[PDB]
Amino acid sequence: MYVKLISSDGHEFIVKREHALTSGTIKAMLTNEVNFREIPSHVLSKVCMYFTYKVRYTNSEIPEFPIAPEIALELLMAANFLDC
């Protein structure tokens, strides 16, 4: 039901399995635990919020998805890697 995503700085993010399958890369992985040696906390947290935001508002007026310009490049790289 839930999967555990681990960041490079050792944070664990417990997300619903169905939400995490928004990522094509993660969907290719799947135990209940995926390790990311290259994605830091402040990026992986946003990635997780994206999963939920997408599942909820896909086929919904859609509110903005907030991204600080300071995290955007790292987020871009992460999202590319994650295929989402």
């Binding site: 960041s7 944070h11 993010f13 417990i14 919020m49 939920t52 909820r56 300071e70 995290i71």
Partner: protein, 99 residues
């Protein structure tokens, strides 16, 4: 309406959702399902303020405007060790700065 939450203790974040009409107790059950510690072994906090088990999440300040999928609200989680630890939440890594 649904509320979206990051339940946080130390370096662990649970991304979950509940209803505004959910009691704090129901949240503790979700946490029990994930972390295998029953409701009476948990304290939940918002804004350094202890949450009452019998209150709805909405009464506690978790609303659709406040706890959104793009921008979830944090709930702090403290476990009974006999004695409850003080709230320990580790920050995420610091975002870089621009040029």
């Amino acid at each position: 309406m649904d509320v979206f939450l990051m339940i946080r203790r130390h370096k662990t974040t649970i991304f979950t959702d509940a209803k505004e009409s959910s009691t704090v107790f129901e949240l503790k059950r979700i946490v029990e399902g994930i972390l295998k510690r029953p409701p009476d072994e948990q304290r939940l906090y918002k804004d350094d303020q202890l949450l009452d088990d019998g209150k709805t999440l909405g009464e506690c300040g978790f609303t659709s405007q406040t706890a959104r999928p793009q921008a979830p609200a944090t709930v702090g989680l403290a476990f009974r060790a006999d004695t409850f630890e003080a709230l320990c939440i580790e920050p995420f890594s610091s975002p870089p700065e621009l040029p």
